[PDB]
Amino acid sequence: ASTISVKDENGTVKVPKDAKRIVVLEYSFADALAALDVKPVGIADDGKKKRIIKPVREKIGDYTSVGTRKQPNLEEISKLKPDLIIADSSRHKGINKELNKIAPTLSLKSFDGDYKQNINSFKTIAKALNKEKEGEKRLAEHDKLINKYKDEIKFDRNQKVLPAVVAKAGLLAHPNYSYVGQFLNELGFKNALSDDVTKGLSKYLKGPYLQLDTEHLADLNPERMIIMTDHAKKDSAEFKKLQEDATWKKLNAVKNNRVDIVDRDVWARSRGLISSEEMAKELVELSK
């Protein structure tokens, strides 16, 4: 037997050539596998299978939950006897050793990665599986759709945007170095957050997700906003209190009718080729 050496975030990992059983510890690595018609046996899916977007979910089929992304359950991982574990370079720094005792571990950008880096992690997975060819063609299909949709989005690009989650209790802004933000940058948009106001702002779980006081909100006064939510009725008790707040009402985007509410699973959690493809289709349909 032999190996394929692959550069992960730490350094060169030795992945078995025959790698058949894969545990993945972020949704985005589950999207990468699906796009190479490879199906993992384990997913850290927060116990919530529906957080795996539709085209991925049905292309993966039936798998085993290894628990939360934040705290993957090591005995369920072990029992699955994976030939390879794809872990997040941010989320799982602390279980990296204990993952390697189970199986050779590829630590990659996901949670703290912007749009390009997540795509870089996809290429790394494809090389590790020896599917470079499929990988390039899928990306070539990807680079086409995205740019196609980019040419059809009828929003004016000069109206700066703030993408945010209203966390519980929020707000969390997604800057230019978040997945959403850069993806919007790649589509032509300018983040309302300047690459200098973000200087401070505390981070959420070490990722590019930045706590904003309602007064930071008013100061930057974005011209467009994109609020990511998990509520099917796009309601949220949390968000409705923000909409009553006098200082929210005075925002430029609120007053010029340019607030779009979208699905957080799809926009923020997924971080895959398919999910960006839905994000860009949406934005064409929202542009009208």
Residue of the chain from 102, 165, 220, 225 that contacts ligand SF8 (CB under 6 A):
165
Residue of the chain from 37, 195, 213, 245 that contacts Zn ion (CB under 5 A):
213
Q: Which does 150 bind (CB under 5 to 8 A by kind): Zn ion, ligand SF8, none?
A: none
Q: Which does 69 bind (CB under 5 to 8 A by kind): Zn ion, ligand SF8, none?
A: ligand SF8
- Contact status: 50 vs ligand SF8 (CB under 6 A): no
To ligand SF8, the closest distance from the beta carbon of 107 in angstroms equals 16
Contact between 69 and 4 (Cβ < 8 Å) = no
Alpha carbons 32 and 10: distance in angstroms, whole number? 20
Query: C-alpha 12: how far from its chain's center?
Result: 24
Kindly indicate which of the ranges 2-10, 245-253, 261-269, 272-280 contains the residues binding ligand SF8, using the contact rule CB under 6 A: 261-269
Q: Which does 248 bind (CB under 5 to 8 A by kind): ligand SF8, Zn ion, none?
A: none
Measured in degrees and rounded to the nearest 5, phi and psi for residue 77 equal -55, -60
Among 104, 99, 133, 81, smallest CA distance to 8 is for 104
Residue of the chain from 217, 226, 269, 278 that contacts ligand SF8 (CB under 6 A):
269
- Contact status: 234 vs Zn ion (CB under 5 A): no
- Contact status: 111 vs ligand SF8 (CB under 6 A): yes
- Contact status: 62 vs Zn ion (CB under 5 A): no
Residue of the chain from 231, 240, 241, 250 that contacts Zn ion (CB under 5 A):
231
DSSP letter for each residue of 127-182? HHTT-HHHHHHHHHHHHHHHHHHHTT--S-TTS-EEEEE--SS--EE--TTSHHHH
Measured in degrees and rounded to the nearest 5, phi and psi for residue 249 equal -60, -30
To ligand SF8, the closest distance from the beta carbon of 4 in angstroms equals 28
Residue of the chain from 268, 273, 279, 280 that contacts ligand SF8 (CB under 6 A):
268
- 103-108's contacts with Cβ under 8 Å and 24+ in sequence apart are 103/23, 104/13, 104/14, 104/15, 104/16, 105/8, 105/13, 106/6, 106/8, 106/13, 106/15, 107/8, 107/9, 107/10, 107/13, 108/8, 108/9, 108/29
Q: Which does 233 bind (CB under 5 to 8 A by kind): Zn ion, ligand SF8, none?
A: Zn ion
Binding to ligand SF8, residues 190-229 (CB under 6 A):
204, 209
- Contact status: 264 vs ligand SF8 (CB under 6 A): yes
- Residue ranges in 169-271 assigned as alpha helix (H): 179-186, 214-220, 237-244, 246-249, 252-255, 264
Q: Compare residues 226 and 268 and give the one whose CB is closer to ligand SF8.
A: 268
Q: Which residues bind ligand SF8 (CB under 6 A)?
A: 46, 69-70, 111, 165, 167-168, 172, 204, 209, 264, 268-269
